Design a protein around this ligand. Structure first.
Ligand SMILES: O=C(O)c1ccc(-c2oc3c(Cl)cc(Cl)cc3c(=O)c2O)cc1
Ligand SMILES: [Cl-]
Length: 331
């Protein structure tokens, strides 16, 4: 049984307390809403229920940008995303927020981002080499270590939210609409991230999580790339999602996790979790993915995909792993 006061982040815990209230009090942020008519929408790029994203042209200087039209959400959530993007501007592999505009007629707010010649991850993951996976995971870890060091949890890390220009070897972490400031001992909403990338803490309703949530999501991405099984944990709902995790990580460490953090498990799980062994990571190797798997890759994966969020590697610890030695050597 751990501290009755709850979990605390192992790194970057005091970041926001060392900065002024204006840094993290996003409700007090006052954005400068410009005129969206300065941008000509060209073509829809995708996305879903929170926004619609368009390729666009800055009419004044003809520069190619991306416009994200914010579907009706609470103004508070809009201030949070804008403030976080402003705090993170210039960050390593963070998407650059260019402008904050509103449609002159509808007054619907929109965010303007830099354009990156992205390759769909469904297509990119089929052609990634062993070195490519290490390179892009390393660049993604730079983005996560940066935002974590700025006191921010992304909380929606997934392949859809990682833009990659495979020709120029450029990576940008996008979609900061679910990001939040980390404050020690704060309890957070667990309805974040995509189902396939939700950490165990979200699935068992443990609200006192921290940056390590993003590290679970990253481990899910690493597993899907080196094993060519995307997504790796392919649950049908939130209950089945934890079952599919428990069938790989085993149930003993799951119940040990619940006991350590005094988590009251939803009684529905007791009829579906069962008892499962902790599987060996080598069991997912086959002839089609063997060239992407190495002992260093399995060791890193094993140290990211842990129930205990406190035992997961931090972003900086993961960056120092021998799995990235070829990337570090290439400067
Ligand atoms: O919600 C967000 O924060 C957010 C931010 C950026 C983008 C974004 O998407 C792109 C897509 Cl989907 C395709 C292509 Cl070819 C290029 C881009 C791009 O350059 C770009 O910036 C999408 C969403
Ligand atoms: Cl076991």
């Amino acid at each position: 049984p751990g501290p009755a006061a709850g979990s605390r982040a192992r790194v970057y815990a005091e970041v926001n307390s060392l900065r002024s209230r204006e840094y993290w009090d996003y409700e007090a942020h006052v954005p400068s809403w410009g005129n969206q008519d300065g941008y000509q929408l060209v073509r829809k790029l995708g996305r879903g229920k929170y926004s619609e994203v368009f390729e666009a042209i800055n009419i004044t200087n003809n520069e190619r940008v991306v416009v994200k039209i914010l579907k009706p959400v609470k103004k508070k959530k809009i201030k949070r995303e804008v403030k976080i993007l402003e705090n993170l501007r210039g960050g390593t592999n963070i998407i650059k927020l260019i402008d904050t505009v509103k449609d002159p007629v509808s007054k619907t707010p929109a965010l303007v981002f830099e354009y990156i010649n992205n390759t769909d991850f469904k297509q990119l993951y089929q052609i990634l080499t062993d070195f490519d996976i290490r390179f892009y995971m390393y660049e993604l870890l730079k983005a996560l270590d940066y935002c974590h060091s700025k006191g921010i949890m992304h909380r929606d890390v997934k392949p859809h939210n990682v833009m990659i220009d495979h020709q120029q070897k450029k990576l940008r972490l996008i979609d900061w609409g679910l990001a939040e400031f980390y404050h020690p001992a704060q309890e957070y909403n667990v309805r974040v991230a995509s189902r396939y990338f939700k950490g165990p803490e979200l699935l068992v309703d443990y609200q006192m999580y921290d940056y390590s949530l993003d590290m679970w999501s990253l481990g899910c991405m690493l597993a899907s790339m080196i094993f060519r099984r995307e997504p790796f944990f392919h649950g049908q709902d939130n209950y089945d999602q934890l079952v599919r995790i428990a069938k790989v990580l085993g149930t003993e460490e799951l119940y040990g996790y619940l006991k350590k953090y005094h988590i009251d498990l939803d009684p529905h799980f007791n009829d579906i979790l069962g008892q499962h062994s902790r599987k060996r990571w080598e069991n997912f190797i086959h002839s089609e993915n063997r060239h992407l798997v190495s002992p260093e890759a399995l060791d890193l994966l094993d140290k990211l995909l842990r129930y205990d969020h406190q035992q997961r590697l931090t972003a900086k610890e993961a960056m120092e792993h021998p799995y990235f030695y070829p990337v570090v050597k290439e400067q």
